[PDB]
Amino acid sequence: PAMGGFGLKHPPPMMLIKNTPVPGNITSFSDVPVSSFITQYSTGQVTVEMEWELKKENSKRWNPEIQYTNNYNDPQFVDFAPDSTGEYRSTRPIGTRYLTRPL
């Protein structure tokens, strides 16, 4: 795919949730369907577990490599942490390519 990632013929499947309709007071019969319902919302917890396979580096390069580091000059906040109001801060985009290999 153009955005990035893994292209799959059979992807992890769509998961769908709805609140069941609960009706308001009805005192008479009609063929026409009920349009009056009690107002409701739902809340809960979800857990996702994922397994990943890793490929190890086997480099023979003598000199030291480039690495991602936490490096800031005179910082006024910690990046990837909450602020005084409680809002999360994420200033930098992070890629995967820091290691080097010969062609």
Q: Which chain residues interact with other proteins by CB under 8 A?
A: 59, 61-65, 67
- Return the number of the residue (61 or 89) whose C-beta is nearest other proteins: 61
Find the length of the chain: 103
Closest distance to other proteins from the beta carbon of 62 (Å): 6
Query: How near is the Cβ of 101 to other proteins at its closest, in Å?
Result: 13
Q: How far is the CB of 55 from other proteins (least distance, A)?
A: 15
C-beta of residue 48 within 8 angstroms of C-beta of residue 58: no
Q: Residue 22 CA to chain centroid, in angstroms?
A: 32
Q: Which is nearer to other proteins, 77 or 100 (CB)?
A: 100
Query: 9-45: b or e for each residue (b if 16 or more CB lie within 10 Å)?
Result: eeeeeeeeeeeeeeeeeeeeeeeeeeeeeeeeeeeee
Of 58 and 73, the one with the shorter C-beta distance to other proteins is 58
